[PDB]
């Protein structure tokens, strides 16, 4: 009947773009259910949050069947 | 049916709008089977005589690019929607042997006296026009004559009723459909 | 070679971005002519601020 009541905007998005250099446990993408899949050396935590495990450069490559988006980190 | 052209070595948006107000020209292209596409300027006055002609759409037109001559058939008319006038033309080279689909007008030649008109309630409603073609360019169908002087009331006309004379096919019969053409019904 | 430029408009109603393209060339005020080393990245600043300038060669 009356309607205000929004929420407080959880600050999602994609950090660490296509040519960065990452540390051991950085946050790559704050996902909301797998826009991006776990590529070569990344983690996929509890609420589908991609994080690194090794060092290098982010790739953002599209692979395979289903055309899914794979975030791999390359030792380069 | 004859028209002469030029070369148009200036592309883009800005150079393509100065043509239409300074010199009154219309852009075009000539793309075909064995050659490259070639852009072209034409005048708005000379296309106006051809577009006013009846069967000029389903007909071979010669083109003088420079002194270059080519038998050219027209399949597009981009047209200005607001005021109403011609924009760029986009026609086609004609090879002496190629399959060459195009579009053909209709006429409905004999409907002054029909069985549904003079006996029953008289209405004839033309649904379709501009039926396509798929024919070698050695024989050009300028038009197709359809006769509805004998079809009674309550009957419709499919595409199988009218015919395509002397080596002409119909693409809609090459698919699994047969579109209705004309109806005869009762007025209200 | 080089090319000389001439600041022919004022800087006091402009953006925060054209006002730094002109300062990157080295122009301080109106009717002030400098020489630039005509690299591909020094003539990229000229293409932004083309209307404040008189590129008289």
């Amino acid at each position: 009947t009356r309607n205000g009541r929004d929420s407080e905007s959880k600050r999602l998005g994609v950090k660490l773009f296509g040519g960065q250099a990452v540390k051991a446990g950085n946050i790559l993408v704050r996902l909301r259910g797998t826009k991006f899949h776990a590529g070569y050396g990344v983690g996929l935590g509890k609420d589908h949050t991609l994080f690194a495990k090794v060092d290098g450069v982010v790739k953002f490559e599209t692979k395979g069947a289903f055309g899914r988006k794979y975030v791999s980190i390359v030792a380069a | 049916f004859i028209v002469n052209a030029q070369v148009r070595s200036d592309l883009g948006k800005g150079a393509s709008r100065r043509l239409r107000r300074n010199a009154g020209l219309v852009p075009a292209v000539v793309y075909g089977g064995d050659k490259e596409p070639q852009s072209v300027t034409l005048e708005l006055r000379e296309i106006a005589k051809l577009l006013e002609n009846e069967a000029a759409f389903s007909h071979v037109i010669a083109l003088n690019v420079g002194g270059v001559k080519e038998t050219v058939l027209i399949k597009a008319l981009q047209r200005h929607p607001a005021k109403g006038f011609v924009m760029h033309a986009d026609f086609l080279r004609v090879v002496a042997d190629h399959k060459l689909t195009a579009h053909v007008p209709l006429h409905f030649i004999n409907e002054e006296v029909a069985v549904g008109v003079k006996q029953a309630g008289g209405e004839i409603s033309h649904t379709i026009s501009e039926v396509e073609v798929s024919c070698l360019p050695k024989d050009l169908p300028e038009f197709i004559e359809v006769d509805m002087a004998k079809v009674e009331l309550g009957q419709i006309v499919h595409l199988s009723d009218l015919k395509a004379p002397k080596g002409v096919e119909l693409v809609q019969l090459a698919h699994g459909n047969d579109l209705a053409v004309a109806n005869i019904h009762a007025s209200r | 070679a080089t090319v000389k430029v001439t600041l022919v408009k004022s800087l006091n109603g402009r953006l925060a971005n054209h006002k730094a393209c002109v300062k990157g060339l080295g122009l301080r005020r109106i009717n002030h002519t400098v020489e630039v080393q005509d690299t591909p990245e020094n003539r990229g600043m000229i293409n932004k601020a083309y209307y404040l300038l008189r590129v008289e060669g």
Binding site: - | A82, G84, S125 | -
Partner: protein
């Protein structure tokens, strides 16, 4: 009048009315048409004032198509009401016209009986509408 049967929502934004009309500017069914050369918006009672003008200057036959359909609800606040206590109720329905759009089509009549019939329907519409033929 002409309005949807049921709607997924109830009220809608205003928006704008930009651009020309590239799809909608070609005559498809009839052989004469009344296309619109000025932008505006039609309020679904003007359509019935213009339909009932064409359907009594013929009285013999022909066939009429109505190419445009209003689906955009508009609001109106009541009187002696200050501003800001919500949003007003839906009073009527609006189609949005932009230059080139074809409004009515006719066929099965003469070339000049129809020409003086769209003169009647143009005097009920708030737009500058022209006369066009099938090619």
């Amino acid at each position: 009048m002409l309005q949807p049967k049921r709607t997924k929502f109830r009220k809608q934004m205003t928006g704008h009315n930009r651009g020309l009309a590239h799809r909608g500017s070609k005559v498809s069914f009839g052989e004469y048409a009344l296309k619109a050369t000025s932008r505006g918006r039609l309020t679904a009672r003007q359509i019935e004032s213009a339909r009932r003008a064409l359907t009594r200057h013929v009285k013999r036959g022909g066939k009429i198509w109505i190419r445009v359909f209003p689906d955009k609800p508009v609001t109106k606040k009541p009187l002696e009401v200050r501003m800001g206590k919500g949003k007003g109720g839906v009073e009527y329905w609006v189609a949005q016209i932009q230059p080139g759009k074809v409004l009515y089509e006719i066929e099965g009549v003469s070339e000049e009986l129809a020409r003086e019939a769209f003169a009647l329907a143009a005097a009920k519409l708030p737009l500058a509408t022209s006369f066009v033929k099938r090619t």
